[PDB]
Structures are given as structure tokens and as C-alpha cells.
Design an enzyme around this catalytic site. Structure first.
Site, PDB file in Angstrom:
ATOM      1  N   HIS A  67       0.865  -1.179   0.000  1.00  0.00           N
ATOM      2  CA  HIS A  67       0.000   0.000   0.000  1.00  0.00           C
ATOM      3  C   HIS A  67       0.900   1.226   0.000  1.00  0.00           C
ATOM      4  CE1 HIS A  67      -3.495  -2.463   1.909  1.00  0.00           C
ATOM      5  NE2 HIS A  67      -3.614  -2.407   0.595  1.00  0.00           N
ATOM      6  N   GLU A  70       1.814   4.096   2.744  1.00  0.00           N
ATOM      7  CA  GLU A  70       2.354   3.681   4.045  1.00  0.00           C
ATOM      8  C   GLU A  70       3.878   3.851   4.070  1.00  0.00           C
ATOM      9  OE1 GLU A  70       0.727  -0.244   4.611  1.00  0.00           O
ATOM     10  OE2 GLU A  70      -1.320   0.489   4.299  1.00  0.00           O
ATOM     11  N   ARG A 125      -3.362   4.405  -2.282  1.00  0.00           N
ATOM     12  CA  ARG A 125      -3.256   3.075  -1.654  1.00  0.00           C
ATOM     13  C   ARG A 125      -3.058   1.942  -2.668  1.00  0.00           C
ATOM     14  NH1 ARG A 125      -5.646   0.290   2.903  1.00  0.00           N
ATOM     15  NH2 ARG A 125      -6.667  -1.707   2.398  1.00  0.00           N
ATOM     16  N   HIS A 194       2.934  -3.368   6.774  1.00  0.00           N
ATOM     17  CA  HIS A 194       2.035  -2.246   6.537  1.00  0.00           C
ATOM     18  C   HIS A 194       2.176  -1.219   7.672  1.00  0.00           C
ATOM     19  CE1 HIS A 194      -1.025  -4.112   3.612  1.00  0.00           C
ATOM     20  NE2 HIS A 194      -0.195  -5.108   3.870  1.00  0.00           N
ATOM     21  N   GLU A 268       1.513  -4.065  11.429  1.00  0.00           N
ATOM     22  CA  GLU A 268       1.018  -2.700  11.277  1.00  0.00           C
ATOM     23  C   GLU A 268       1.898  -1.799  12.141  1.00  0.00           C
ATOM     24  OE1 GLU A 268      -0.972  -1.558   9.219  1.00  0.00           O
ATOM     25  OE2 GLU A 268      -2.610  -2.974   8.794  1.00  0.00           O
TER      26      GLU A 268
END
Ligand code: BTW
Ligand code: ZN
Length: 303
Positions: A67, A70, A125, A194, A268
Site C-alpha cells: 500500500h 504507508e 493506496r 504495513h 502494522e
């Protein structure tokens, strides 16, 4: 060189690709640059192979930047690459890992999106594939994998941020990874990076059914987040995708786990939403440092 490179600032696509070439030139006995495909718009897709030898050694897959917005992830990937070359032959644990296993690191998994975040839209994204009979562009590459593809947790609307595409592996950025991993046949871990939310996730996202390796992967995740937290006190939650972030279908670690790669996890990274995707450059190095401890912990469990 990689010794004059600024690891504490955000870079462009060209600067990151240049970094790869510099690292390979400096460390020819450890690092090589592989091209595993082309993006939709024709940019090369590059993977750094870290290896001390062998043939078809058991391997760790790590991807970042699937993505594009990020940005902390591509920045962390560059830092990881340099760190691997510094620590091999110096850190006992990492030396043991690379003596037995190869690491394949894809720093910019979605190069078209990454370029677009610099030229046009910082919060892009998706990929940049052209959708037939639509005014909208791009597929969510983390809804495009063959694991509960098209089910709840993704969208069939081309203009959606979570558009899954017309069929699983429609996106060349995804198919390139699938082909590489399946042809290799000896991947033991599959780690996708991510941001944001400070979570460590294991399968599944598409179903509430628990994985048969839940006890082990849960303990591995717990150990990895404790190692991460040890450095600066950054707090992470951990659990399955569906229980810990949200239901999501066609996600990459659900595919990798179902293919037989037991140690399949998604990070994340920082933060939890204060700055979100616009995490400042001043947090790149501490984020990368603590995340490295988590990743190394997972690798130790794999070896
Ligand atoms: C970080 C978010 S952008 C990520 C969460 C996720 C979903 C499915 C599998 C692993 C992780 C996403 O929505 O793709
Ligand atoms: Zn994401």
C-alpha cells in the site's frame, strides 16, 4: 554510497532503487538484486536476496509498501537492508539465521503507487491498473490474493479503496510474488509490512475460523511484540486479522498460510492514528529499530 545515505528521511522511488544498487555493489558476496516482474505501468519490481550460499535454502519472505501511502514501511525496508549487511558476522543470532536461511526483501511492492504518492496523491493506496468501463484506477493489492477472494472484507466497486479486481492475482504486482514464492518452493516465513495501528497479525482475515497453528503463532506474535516493546516501550496488540483489525478478504498472509507457509504474519507499524500515514521522518529510525527486534524474533522461531 549506503554509508552516506540518509536513513532518517523519506525517499523517492529512484533514490530507493539507487540504494539497492549501491548495497549490491558494496556487498557482492551477500546481496543480489532480482527482478521478479514489471508493474502495470512498466517499472521493474525488485527483490533483494540476502544469502551466504547453499542452493534453494529455506527462506524468509518480507514485503513492504504493498500500500503505497504507508511510507514508514518502505523507509523501514531500506533500514532493514543496510542492517542485514552490518549485522552478518557481528550479531550471533542474525549470523546464525543467514548461515542457515536466505532472506528475500521487497522494499517497494507497489512501485506505481509509490511514484504516484510523490507526484500526485500522497494518500494513494492501490495499484494503478486501468479498469475497463470505469473512470477509476487501481486495485487493492492486499485484497487480490487467492484466499477467500471476493468475500466480505473487500469491494467489487472499481472506485473503492478496497476494490479486489476482477479475479485473484489479476494484479501483476501480486502475481509476480505468487510465482516467485511458488517456484522457489522453500519459503518458511512470509512477512508483509504495513502501517499503521501497532498490531502484529496472523491469519485469518476472511473467516472467524481459527487456524490450526493458532497456539504457536499466537505465542510467536506475543514474543515478537514483547521484543519490539523492549526497546522504547511501544505497545502493540496481536491476534488474528479478523479479531484484531477487521474482516478482510484476499489478504496475502491468508494465501501464504493456506499454501503451507506456517509463519505468516502482517505488521502494522507506528503510530495508532495521531499522525497516521503522515508519520514524521523523525520516527523512521526508532520505528525501524524496534520493528527489527520483532522481525528477528520471528526469524529465530523459524530457524
Ligand atoms: C494495514 C491495513 S491497510 C491492512 C490490514 C490487513 C488486512 C488483511 C491481511 C493483513 C492485514 C489491510 O487492510 O490490507
Ligand atoms: Zn495497508
Amino acid at each position: 554510497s549506503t554509508n552516506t545515505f540518509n536513513y532518517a528521511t523519506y525517499h523517492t522511488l529512484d533514490e530507493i532503487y539507487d540504494f539497492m544498487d549501491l548495497l549490491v555493489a558494496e556487498h557482492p558476496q551477500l546481496v543480489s538484486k532480482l527482478q521478479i516482474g514489471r508493474s502495470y505501468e512498466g517499472r521493474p519490481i525488485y527483490v533483494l536476496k540476502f544469502s551466504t550460499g547453499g542452493s534453494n535454502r529455506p527462506a524468509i519472505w518480507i514485503d513492504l509498501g504493498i500500500h503505497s501511502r504507508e511510507w514508514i514501511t518502505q523507509a523501514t525496508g531500506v533500514w532493514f537492508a543496510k542492517k542485514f549487511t552490518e549485522d552478518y558476522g557481528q550479531d550471533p543470532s542474525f549470523t546464525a539465521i543467514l548461515d542457515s536461511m536466505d532472506i528475500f526483501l521487497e522494499i517497494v511492492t507497489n512501485p506505481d503507487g509509490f511514484a504516484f504518492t510523490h507526484s500526485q496523491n500522497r494518500l494513494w493506496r492501490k495499484t494503478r491498473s486501468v479498469t475497463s468501463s470505469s473512470l477509476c484506477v487501481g486495485v487493492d493489492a492486499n485484497r487480490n490474493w487467492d484466499a477467500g477472494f471476493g468475500k466480505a472484507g473487500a469491494s467489487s466497486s472499481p472506485c473503492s479503496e478496497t476494490y479486489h479486481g476482477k479475479y485473484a492475482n489479476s494484479e501483476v504486482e501480486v502475481k509476480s510474488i505468487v510465482d516467485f514464492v511458488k517456484d522457489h518452493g522453500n519459503f518458511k516465513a512470509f512477512l508483509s509490512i504495513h502501517s499503521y495501528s501497532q498490531l502484529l497479525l496472523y491469519p485469518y482475515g476472511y473467516t472467524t475460523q481459527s487456524i490450526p497453528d493458532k497456539t504457536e503463532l499466537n505465542q510467536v506474535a506475543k514474543s515478537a511484540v514483547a521484543a519490539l516493546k523492549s526497546l522504547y516501550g511501544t505497545s502493540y496488540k496481536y491476534g488474528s486479522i479478523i479479531t484484531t483489525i477487521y474482516q478482510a478478504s484476499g489478504g496475502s498472509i491468508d494465501w501464504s498460510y493456506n499454501q503451507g507457509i506456517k509463519y505468516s504474519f502482517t505488521f502494522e507499524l507506528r503510530d495508532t492514528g495521531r499522525y497516521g500515514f503522515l508519520l514524521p521522518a523523525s520516527q523512521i529510525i526508532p520505528t525501524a529499530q524496534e520493528t527489527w527486534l520483532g522481525v528477528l524474533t520471528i526469524m529465530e522461531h523459524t530457524v
